[PDB]
Amino acid sequence: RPTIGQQMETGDQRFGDLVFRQLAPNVWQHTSYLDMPGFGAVASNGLIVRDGGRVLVVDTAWTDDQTAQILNWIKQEINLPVALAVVTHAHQDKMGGMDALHAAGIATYANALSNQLAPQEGMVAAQHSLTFAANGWVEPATAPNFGPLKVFYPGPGHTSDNITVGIDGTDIAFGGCLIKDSKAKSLGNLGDADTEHYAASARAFGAAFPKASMIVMSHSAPDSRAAITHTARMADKLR
Amino acid sequence: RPTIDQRFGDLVFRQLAPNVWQHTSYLDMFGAVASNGLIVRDGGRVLVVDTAWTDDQTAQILNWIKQEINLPVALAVVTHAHQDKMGGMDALHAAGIATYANALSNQLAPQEGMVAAQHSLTFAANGWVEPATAPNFGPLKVFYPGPGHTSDNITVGIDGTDIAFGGCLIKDSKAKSLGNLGDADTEHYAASARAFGAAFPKASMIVMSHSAPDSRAAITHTARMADKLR
Ligand SMILES: CO/N=C(\C(=O)N[C@H](C(=O)O)[C@@H]1N=C(C(=O)O)[C@@H](COC(N)=O)CS1)c1ccco1
Ligand SMILES: CO/N=C(\C(=O)N[C@H](C(=O)O)[C@@H]1N=C(C(=O)O)[C@@H](COC(N)=O)CS1)c1ccco1
Ligand SMILES: [Zn+2]
Ligand SMILES: [Zn+2]
Ligand SMILES: [Zn+2]
Ligand SMILES: [Zn+2]
């Protein structure tokens, strides 16, 4: 029962300290929890995607130990090798577990800017850098063999480096910490945010994946496209 | 722009009724966390419900009161032993303000990192404050609804207004969860939320610690979320 983040409901599997929810035949959401003394636990969500005989991960958990638990869940429930992970910006909820991925021998990818920022936050860069076109689409040569992961940089918003991921062959897109849920009272932590460009970036994510009906995000349960439009409307108020 | 109106220094004030204002203060951690309390004008004096998160913020509340109302602050009632409600006790005491809390809040206070109030409120089995422990409370009607967000949580209605204050017990009607349940009584929470509603059956404006004022649907929704904890 986290203080911040969705609660457990039917469909969820508790595994160690984490929760897993199947979203599609080949897509699961991982959820891990950071305890803040005096405040309680904060949930963060990422994705696990099966692509034939391999698995792809989006985001670490908050810590190495929690991230190793994700890998243990994958071993138990899927029993296929993890080919690569993509992490969606240089904050602890998304990149706190890089060492566990590296120890397991998993190739890691992040926005070049996230890799440049990571050490400034005490964290470990991904081993490979993604770069983007002027319209936000990832440069394909930087994202080799990504299978159904369609990476899109929507512009600065929650952070300047935030990226998003569509899951090709499904109706799911992942907004990470850029997108908040359709009932959210606020845009979360704006400490590293670009308040001028946020609204346009949220809308750009929606336009990049115009047919995604299930929007997955870091700190609330999967939602409708109203998460994207509500996020953009909250962001409009920041300018 | 907290992670979780009149600006005055680091605080925000909102008038809810001719003699009632909501105070809001922010704890920067992750980002800033808002907490709300109340300021009430009665009979030439001001009564405060809850401190801000810190002594300095609470001193700013007293300064706002000086500038906007300019009447003596007679007493404060604080609604449980957590930082959002009791973090500023020293500032109230320095200013000569008499402070009141549930006896249990005062006993938990040091263990929770808080300075105890000067006076202890006690309660009947039905939840209503024992009158002799709450002298000169004016329109404040203090009710202990049972364990919920914490075992010590109390609530406050304002007679002659449409307002009741649920503090951290009550969450808003659109809330996804009950906030921090680390110190909560998950078995009794739903009954306690319902007891608050029944204690203040007339109140149409429900004020709470971590959301803007809401309708009575906040009570109903909070109880229903709490039913699920059992
Ligand atoms: C380097 O990052 N350090 C983190 C961290 O990852 N914080 C992130 C952030 O602040 O952007 C998390 N992400 C957030 C987000 O809006 O995406 C918020 C979520 O917290 C809530 N309740 O919104 C704060 S917690 C941290 C320290 C303590 C809690 O989080
Ligand atoms: C002793 O209290 N220490 C506090 C504190 O006041 N915490 C309170 C609590 O945990 O109940 C606050 N109250 C809460 C509540 O549900 O009433 C939550 C609100 O935080 C959120 N966004 O739910 C966490 S912050 C604290 C320490 C560090 C941050 O807050
Ligand atoms: Zn972030
Ligand atoms: Zn985040
Ligand atoms: Zn509390
Ligand atoms: Zn609280």
Q: Which two tokens stand for residue B129?
A: 């404050």
Residues lining ion ligand 6 (Cβ < 5 A) are B 84, 168, 209
C-alpha A225/C-alpha B110 separation (Å) is 47
- Partners of B180 in the β-ladder: none
B-chain residues near A5 (CB < 8 A): 177
Q: In a 10 Å sphere around its CB, with 0-12 CB exposed, 13-18 middle and 19+ buried, how is residue A79 labelled?
A: exposed
Q: Which two tokens stand for residue A81?
A: 């090798």
Interface contact flag, B177 A238, Cβ < 8 Å: no
Q: Which two tokens stand for residue A212?
A: 């995604």
Query: Around A52, how many Cα atoms within 13 Å sit in the side-chain half-sphere?
Result: 5
Instruction: Residue A88: name the closest of A159, A35, A22, A20 by CA.
Output: A159
Instruction: Residue A32: name the closest of A80, A96, A99, A76 by CA.
Output: A96
Q: Which two tokens stand for residue A142?
A: 């930087």
A72 in contact with ligand 1, CB cutoff 6 A: no
Q: Which helix (H) or strand (E) holds A24?
A: strand A18-24
Is domain B1-230 classified as CATH 3.60.15.10? yes
CA distance B4 to chain A (A): 7
Instruction: Residue A149: name the closest of A22, A26, A13, A12 by CA.
Output: A26
- Partners of A223 in the β-ladder: A215
What is the three-state SS of chain B?
CCCCCEEECCEEEEEEECCEEEEEEEEECCCEEEEEEEEEEECCEEEEECCCCCHHHHHHHHHHHHHHCCCCEEEEECCCCCHHHHCCHHHHHHCCCEEEEEHHHHHHHHHHCCCCCCEEECECCCCEECHHHCCCCCCEEEECCCCCCCCCCCEEEECCCCEEEEECCCCCCCCCCCCCCCCCCCCCHHHHHHHHHHHCCCCCEEEECCCCCECCHHHHHHHHHHHCCC
C-alpha A34/C-alpha A4 separation (Å) is 10
Query: Around A78, how many Cα atoms within 13 Å sit in the side-chain half-sphere?
Result: 24
Q: In a 10 Å sphere around its CB, with 0-12 CB exposed, 13-18 middle and 19+ buried, how is residue A99 labelled?
A: middle
Concatenate the DSSP letters of all residues of A212-235 into one string: --EEEESSS--B-THHHHHHHHHH
Query: Around A222, how many Cα atoms within 13 Å sit in the side-chain half-sphere?
Result: 23
C-alpha A32/C-alpha A12 separation (Å) is 13
For residue A211, which phi and psi values (nearest 5 degrees)? -110, 5
Longest dimension (CA), chain A: 48
C-alpha A16/C-alpha B182 separation (Å) is 19
A93 in contact with ligand 1, CB cutoff 6 A: yes
C-alpha A43/C-alpha A12 separation (Å) is 14
Q: Which helix (H) or strand (E) holds A68?
A: helix A64-77
A-chain residues near B229 (CB < 8 A): 1
Q: What 3-state DSSP class applies to A105? A: coil
C-alpha B17/C-alpha A214 separation (Å) is 43
For residue A82, which phi and psi values (nearest 5 degrees)? -85, 115
B49-69 burial by CB neighbour count: b if 16+ within 10 A, else e? bbbbbbbebbbbbbebbeebe
Instruction: With beta carbons less than 8 A apart as the criterion, state whether B224 and B191 touch.
Output: no
Which residues, 6 or more positions from A234, have their beta carbon under 8 angstroms from its beta carbon? A180, A184, A186, A187
Handedness of CA A1, A164, A10, A227 (dihedral sign): positive
User: Which residues of chain A are at the B interface, by a Cβ-Cβ cutoff of 8 Å?
Assistant: 1-7, 36, 38-40, 42, 181, 183, 185-191, 220-221, 238
C-alpha A45/C-alpha A153 separation (Å) is 19
C-alpha A162/C-alpha A153 separation (Å) is 7
Instruction: With beta carbons less than 8 A apart as the criterion, state whether B166 and B219 touch.
Output: yes
Query: Around B80, how many Cα atoms within 13 Å sit in the side-chain half-sphere?
Result: 24
> Which of left, alpha, beta for B31 (phi over 0: left; psi -120 to 50: alpha)?
left
C-alpha B185/C-alpha B191 separation (Å) is 11
- What is chain B's alpha carbon radius of gyration, rounded to the nearest angstrom? 16
Instruction: With beta carbons less than 8 A apart as the criterion, state whether A124 and A117 touch.
Output: no
CA of A69 to the centre of ligand 1 (A): 21
Interface contact flag, A1 B29, Cβ < 8 Å: no
Which residue bears the tokens 């204050």? B165
Instruction: Residue A59: name the closest of A137, A205, A176 by CA.
Output: A176
B143-171 burial by CB neighbour count: b if 16+ within 10 A, else e? bbbbbbbbbbbbbbbbeebbbbbbbbbbb
Instruction: Residue B162: name the closest of B198, B209, B206, B193 by CA.
Output: B206
Is domain A1-239 classified as CATH 3.30.460.80? no
Determined by X-ray
Q: Which amino acid is at A181?
A: D
Strand B45-49 to strand B73-77: parallel, antiparallel, or no bridges (unpaired)? parallel
Task: State how far Cα A47 lies from the chain centre.
Answer: 7
Q: What 3-state DSSP class applies to A174? A: strand
For residue B87, which phi and psi values (nearest 5 degrees)? -65, -20
Instruction: Residue A87: name the closest of A41, A125, A122, A141 by CA.
Output: A125
Q: What is the number of other CB atoms lying within 10 angstroms of the CB of residue B79?
A: 30
C-alpha A206/C-alpha A186 separation (Å) is 19
C-alpha A88/C-alpha A105 separation (Å) is 19
C-alpha B124/C-alpha B187 separation (Å) is 21
Edge-to-edge strands, sheet with B155-158: B140-143, B155-158, B163-167, B205-208
Which residues, 6 or more positions from A238, have their beta carbon under 8 angstroms from its beta carbon? A187, A190, A193, A195, A196, A198, A199, B1
Going by alpha carbons, the residue nearest to atom 18 of ligand 1 is A189
For chain A, the domains span: 1-239
Instruction: With beta carbons less than 8 A apart as the criterion, state whether B90 and B110 touch.
Output: no
Entry field: residues in chain A: 239
